[PDB]
Amino acid sequence: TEQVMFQPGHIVRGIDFTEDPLLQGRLFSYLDTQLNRNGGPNFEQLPINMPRVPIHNNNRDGAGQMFIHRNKYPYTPNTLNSGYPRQANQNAGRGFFTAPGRTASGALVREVSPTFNDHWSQPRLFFNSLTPVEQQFLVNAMRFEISLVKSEEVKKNVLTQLNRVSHDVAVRVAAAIGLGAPDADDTYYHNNKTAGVSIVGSGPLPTIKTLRVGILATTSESSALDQAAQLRTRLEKDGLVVTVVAETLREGVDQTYSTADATGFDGVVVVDGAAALFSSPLFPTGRPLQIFVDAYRWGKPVGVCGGKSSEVLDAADVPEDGDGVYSEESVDMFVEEFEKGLATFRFTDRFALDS
Amino acid sequence: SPLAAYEVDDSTGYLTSDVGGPIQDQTSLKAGIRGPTLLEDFMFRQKIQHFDHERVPERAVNARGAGAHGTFTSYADWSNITAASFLNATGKQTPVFVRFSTVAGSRGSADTARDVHGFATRFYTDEGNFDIVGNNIPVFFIQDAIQFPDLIHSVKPRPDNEIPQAATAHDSAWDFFSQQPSTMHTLFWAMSGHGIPRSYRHMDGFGVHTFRFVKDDGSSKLIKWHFKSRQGKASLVWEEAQVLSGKNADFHRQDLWDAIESGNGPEWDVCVQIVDESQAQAFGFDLLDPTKIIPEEYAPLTKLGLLKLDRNPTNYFAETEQVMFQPGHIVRGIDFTEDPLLQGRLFSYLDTQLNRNGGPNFEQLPINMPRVPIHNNNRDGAGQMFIHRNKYPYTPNTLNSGYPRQANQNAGRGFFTAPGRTASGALVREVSPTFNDHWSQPRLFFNSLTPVEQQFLVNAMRFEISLVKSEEVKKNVLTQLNRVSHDVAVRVAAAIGLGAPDADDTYYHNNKTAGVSIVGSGPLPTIKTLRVGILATTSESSALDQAAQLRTRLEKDGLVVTVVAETLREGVDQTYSTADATGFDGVVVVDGAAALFSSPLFPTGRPLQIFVDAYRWGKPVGVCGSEVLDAADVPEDGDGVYSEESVDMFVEEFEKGLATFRFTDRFALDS
Amino acid sequence: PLAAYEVDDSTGYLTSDVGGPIQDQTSLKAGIRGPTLLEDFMFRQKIQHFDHERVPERAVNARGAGAHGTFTSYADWSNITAASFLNATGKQTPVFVRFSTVAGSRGSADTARDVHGFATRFYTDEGNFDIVGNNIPVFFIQDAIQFPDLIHSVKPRPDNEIPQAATAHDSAWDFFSQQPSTMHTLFWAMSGHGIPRSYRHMDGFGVHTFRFVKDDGSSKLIKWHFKSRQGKASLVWEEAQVLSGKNADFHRQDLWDAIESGNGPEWDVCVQIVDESQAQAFGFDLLDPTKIIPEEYAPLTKLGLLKLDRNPTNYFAETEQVMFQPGHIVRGIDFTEDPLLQGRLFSYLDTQLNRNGGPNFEQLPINMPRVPIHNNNRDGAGQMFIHRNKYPYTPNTLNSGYPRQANQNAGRGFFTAPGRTASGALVREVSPTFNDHWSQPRLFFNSLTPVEQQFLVNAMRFEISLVKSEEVKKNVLTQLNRVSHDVAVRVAAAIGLGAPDADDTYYHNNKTAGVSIVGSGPLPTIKTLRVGILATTSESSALDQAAQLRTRLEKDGLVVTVVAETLREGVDQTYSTADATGFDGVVVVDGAAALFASSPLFPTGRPLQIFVDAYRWGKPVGVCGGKSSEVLDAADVPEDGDGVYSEESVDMFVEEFEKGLATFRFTDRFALDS
Ligand code: HEM
Ligand code: HEM
Ligand SMILES: [Ca+2]
Ligand SMILES: [Ca+2]
Ligand SMILES: [Ca+2]
Ligand SMILES: [Ca+2]
Ligand SMILES: [Ca+2]
Ligand SMILES: [Ca+2]
Ligand SMILES: [Ca+2]
Ligand SMILES: [Ca+2]
Which of A199, B157, B536, C376 is deepest in the core (most CB within 10 A)? Predict the structure, then answer.
């Protein structure tokens, strides 16, 4: 992984470049930068970089040269090696070839094409295509980052650009930084949308295999660990990755409260045998409840399994009838409902919106 | 062998990039037929990038050299003196690679420079690579490794103008020699024919330092490595070496390559002198001192095995340029000594390879790989070619069950420091007083040379010191030479118009030692590979007939025959224009060519000058079939001068001449 | 010039690189006969440095030597170029020049037969401008992508790395005969241009067509030609072979010495200037680097004087580390679509990463400009600057918009010639206008003198006789025959093959000025030329003669070496170390006549050999004193021979001998094919 050295210059017959000036310059950079990383010119000889076909060429020597070349006439044209290696091109040897319809005309220029000049319509197209909560998250990311910019001039300049994409984005972002948004400039504003760029709108996940479920239990009650073992079995059958959390390790418990965190899970379940936990030298004060509260605040499916739920849900300020909040005595029923929540993945009705 | 797996065949196939994409490489991609070249041309950039990065730093010293592969075969089970696995059974064979080199010249300098020579041998043993990084001279200029940059800066070109190339013939070098008297012994060797060997095959190999042989019972003895050439000892003469440096900079590397290609691969008996630890100061000097030899009179040679070089490299850069030797490549059964020159060497080779290779994985290059499994916790680094399966590369571990396991005197045939070794005293930057005699052994060496040999060494010093501009340095040089031999001081002083200092007899003596003279080592044991130039003419069908008759005879006796004439044709190898006496070990003029001794086809007098140069330089010379000998002012009665009508008779005599190799009576001596 | 970076060690105690005083002569050991200690930091820092002294040699032109100097413009050249270094009569700009061979490694001999580099850096007030040229105006190949093919073929065979610094081997001649574009440069290399007498006696060429661009955007096509003020001179090959052995450092020493004596070499920096409309008007393509513009079609314009007058202080730091680039270009100059030039632009910037081992090679003193640098290049190994601007990106407001963009209209920016265009398919195709590989080789050959043509035939005979492959030799004769049937026949005769039937397609009888060495006439100056005076310590009068000649010769700027059996006052060299290749002219004092008729002090026949060699190689030779027959007879040299002198009078001898030094070579001494 550290030594793999990719290049857009690693192209094959059947593919060609375009005159995208970003692409064009990349072709130089990767070949050159590999000299930096590898410290010499024979980086294509590292195992991870080698091809899976024979190499025939007249490249020689260089630091770290791993081949012993038999051909002692590595120049073209030659007779002393019978004209080998032979040239490959469109008509012989399945050579790479530049698309033959490609042309260039005009002055040799350091000029930008005016066709590149619309920097704002597509940002607006992308924004228009996000759902309302998704638009809010984007506004909030901008509010977070721009509020950390110290220069008032830079912040003003940022609002000027954002406003060219969307007046509303500029207004909402300005609100957090205590500046005024400039007046609407409608040149590039439009209402068009495009498919397949939204995450929130992309629907439930097609598979929940690998998703992580944290089961918060206790060693204080044999009943709680029995619940967690049963839940584990039912969940693991479906390819979910189960972590049972308790105060200390023992058979069946994967993780102590001290090392556990809501970020370790895609869904969190409390077994009702553990309701009492919701201070100790074994974990920070309030840790078990905070794992549940965090998972809820971050949109994850959360639930209590066993039939007794009000104690836990009330301590966590989590409404029993919320979307993505589960309570069932039946392990089977609990898991069936919970797995729907995992595919839904995030319950976005837990996030405030600008009005 | 690591090398077979990495050989790449390009005898068939379409050209590809390094990542296997078929491409072309003859025309740049352009915006129109007369247009500018495009940055998107990856074919151009990958090819030019590789070319732009072909070169690597030359070796800090010994940059000019050539290598070959071969085999070492043990003569015995040497258990009784060493635990070394490669020496543990009669007939046991180990692959070797050897590089020979000069020392001061950069990588494109002439082979026939006057210099110390490197003789570095890698034994790819079944218990690790073992390197003996030796020289063709048994003693070194300096007594402490820390002085190496001083010696080498003084011998290498002056740093303002990088003049002169591959030569000690300048002020700085002789300033160093005259200020650092330890240099005298190696200097005498370099100023002898040992500085200009006839080939790599006609020189011996020496480890220089005292090492230890260590037995499995922990006992040790002190040893000197001496590789004894089976081809004999032979030198050029200095004027021939100078001409050679211009006419064939590649002379030694060509000589070696050709010998191998012809099934005449060079051999050495790999030998040691072996003495007890108690004898470290028993011979009148300290065996930790790398400026001293053990005279053979005090310790004879034990023949351990045969070294044969019999395969050339496939790719010079990948094998010869990239081989990276280290005296730190040691194996169980061998140890170091407290020789301060050897001690510091240990650090230098490991570090300098980072410079050449540009990263730390230089032992992964095929030529540097061992021939046994590697088990260690070395990881990562630029150019990492392995994919290590062990994800717990730390010791001690339980998560990899304790592997790799520690090897030591009692486990896993580990290396171990000789257990009888000790250290005692202050931590000092002081030179042992036992190292202080810088002059007796140079005198021993000089005494041991034949009179003409002593003349040649004197003439070498006369040549070089006359090129020293500084009057003060010249005087200092005579001061030191005079401590070795008053006569050497006198004779050298005469050439530079200075007076020698009065005799200082402190270190004078009349002792001699066997095995250091070239001139005295007798005729060569074989003449195979030696070169005969037959000077002929296209004028006379009879000249060509004569030449071809000589050729049949001489080639059956293993000699390399070159028939020279005005122009090439069937049976003629070389034109006069490209021919030179330095190309030959013997010269024969065929009777029919007597006329040649002006043409637009070669320089005026070239045919005669080849014959005259060969005679002046001491070679066997002859005419097969009066006038030629008169023209060349060569006496018909001369030793190593042949004059016969009978081809068989001529061949028989001439071949004795080739064994004698040099007729030293052609050289004037001081009286 | 680089004074700020000099370090003086003429006084003081030894220190580490961090200024701690230390010693460096004995290792630290556990006891006086003990093992060396790892804690010996004095040892490790010294030896680490030594271990890492070397850097990769240049991929080509590894063997070379450099000096500092000054360029002076002759005029304000505004009317043809915006280049600031050319914008005022008398304007001076510091330069550094490196001269080189091409194929040999470091340590190979100066006097190998080869193309030679002539790379000039102008440290201009608008940036460093490099002209990375050669001593031959045309190059072997027509596309940069072919460079590794040419260089692999010329460099040593890669199994044994043989032969050093030579085209005289199969691969080279295989490549030349398979790639006929090579013929022009090949003919130049086989002429005296392949073995120049010194770096000072050769010219410099940019090779490619470039553009001169005016501030108004208009452009003209130019060829750069640095015309030597020392004259043109070559060695003969046999002499060159001996020199390679006797003095591998010959050209570097010659240059070093000329500068130290106050005879720094000079060139007129010239251009041929033509209109863009003339790119195809001369019967060949100006984009084609295998073609010269005959001077009859476009005369040379003298732009200014280049003079080298200061040697480096440290060869490694200055000469070894200087890193030229044709991409070091300045406002007022631009490139052309020459496909050889085009790819070179990439190569030099990349290859310096190899040599320097890091990206900040422009910060080495020798590579620095003499004007402020303002850019947003940052970090990288070996970063020597401490940049204050903490906003190194454009566009910025946080650094007020600095550095500002420079272009045609502001800040005196470089700009591409605005009339330049491209048109057509993106192609890996050679222009048919490049296809004539033979007419110019023929024009060149036709322009040489008869003995010069013989020398070139003989170079080819020498090299091609060493090619082992019969098929390569036959292919070589096929290509040479397309240039000249007579050349093919004459070369063929040495290798015992038949030349193919005449093919007259590209034969012609046209000639061009300024390409012949032999025809360029006597040297305009004899200052620095070397005279060896052969004497004897056996006769006090021979020493007196040598001394009187010394005075007379040295007065005229000649470098005089007196040779005798042994050194003493007034004798510079012994016979043992003397050689005819060390001299441009040889004089025997008649008091020394007896040595020309055995000694432990030099090789048998040495004194006579020096005289005979000098004669055979065409040099002026003579005897001073009145008694010349003994020496001249022994040397088989005729008294009435041109370039052979015999006078009693020291004054008269020197006047005649000096005319001979300017003639330089007496060509009547060389046999010609019938
Ligand atoms: C007994 C005295 C010594 C002998 C016989 C010796 C022998 C050699 C030989 C034969 C080589 C070339 C190996 C090859 O062919 O690649 C070499 C290289 C080298 N030597 Fe030593 N040497 C000696 C002393 C030293 C000392 C004292 C130092 C430094 C403290 C030293 C540092 C080097 C370095 C830096 C190289 C280049 C190695 C490489 O690039 O792989 N030498 N020496
Ligand atoms: C018109 C033809 C050319 C001329 C006159 C030319 C001239 C030179 C000169 C004079 C040097 C040595 C500069 C110095 O003294 O440091 C040099 C080095 C070099 N050249 Fe060129 N060259 C030409 C074509 C090329 C081409 C086609 C390539 C590759 C595409 C190339 C790649 C190099 C490289 C890699 C070096 C070593 C540069 C360095 O290490 O700094 N040359 N050339
Ligand atoms: Ca193509
Ligand atoms: Ca010096
Ligand atoms: Ca000898
Ligand atoms: Ca063991
Ligand atoms: Ca070859
Ligand atoms: Ca000439
Ligand atoms: Ca590096
Ligand atoms: Ca521009």
Answer: B536
